[PDB]
Design a protein around this ligand. Sequence first.
Ligand SMILES: [Mg+2]
Length: 416
Amino acid sequence: NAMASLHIDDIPAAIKAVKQQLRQALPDYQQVFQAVEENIRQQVMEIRRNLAEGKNPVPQLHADDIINGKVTEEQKAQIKQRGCCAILGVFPQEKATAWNREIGDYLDRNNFVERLKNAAEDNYFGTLAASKPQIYGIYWSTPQVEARQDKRMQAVQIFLNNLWQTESNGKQHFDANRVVTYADRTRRRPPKSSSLGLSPHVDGGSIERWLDENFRHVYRHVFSGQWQKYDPFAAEGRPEVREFPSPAVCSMFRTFQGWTALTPQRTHAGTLNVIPIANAMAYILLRALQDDVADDDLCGAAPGRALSASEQWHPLLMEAISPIPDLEAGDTVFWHCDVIHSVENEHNGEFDSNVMYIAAAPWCEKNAAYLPRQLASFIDGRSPPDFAADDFEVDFIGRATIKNLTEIGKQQLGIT
Ligand SMILES: [Mg+2]
């Protein structure tokens, strides 16, 4: 892994060398950028018109329609263009509401906040992070384990993964019909809380999208100027990309990140914002090559900092920010791994806005390789390897175990 041997202080020199190579290979970088900008602008004006009409630009589907095979080709096309989808009714509302209360009880009974405070660093940043937590480092509550293995959730993830072009050159880059579980955290945001959550960003790499030759293969049609051929839903190359090692790195390739609502979700009540433009990354990649950007800079992209879109460098994309649709408990929302997103700053609702992080991850060699060490952490109750080794749940009363798993649950965790 070339990104694994790049020293943090050599990044500016690396960027300078790679930017000169990319501008040399794409000498019309300005004209190509302006062409891509026009394509982005048309999508922006459609999204703004949707919002002005009272329509949310994020496609919405019912889980029943996915399960029963009723989704139209036009709906699939809209999802691929917008890069995201709310899927309603994955879980019965009553089950999700019981899950919400059960996570609360699990956190309360086991003194989560006192443990977090006790483990925090004795400095301003340590105290700050532990004071009023919104993102909870618990992985193995019974609601999380049950939601991940649910057979309706599985069918929804298989549907999302089948939107991708999974095969090219004789090779299946992932098996869209097989799901694996990626354990992750849960969020509880109280009314009137501020957010220190990150500004509009894309997870899964920042400087590496330019500096890593595997990432550049994923974006080859962008860097060659043939941007109309760039397909966000092409799988080829994505399991092979290389990241700068840091706590931001996910060991699995996730096709879609996702939220499962434990409570109703509403605009101005701590919900999620997205920019529903699946090919926005093509604009971000080319923007950093323009003449008003310093030779050693990629518009602020930094190691360990999710790639951010900003009013400074990407004001056109900021014009397309949209809240996700209203959701009820048991609904879900998913967004393509390249889709820019950020939680809302405002929560003026009456109750805590709570979600579980549950992504879609297809079977591939990369994701299969993470299952054994993830499984070891489930067995122990430890944090999974991609997270801080808080290991809060090692002695939590009520932590889920293998007894909670169905056969599907076991397969998705690599137990069978
Ligand atoms: Mg994010």
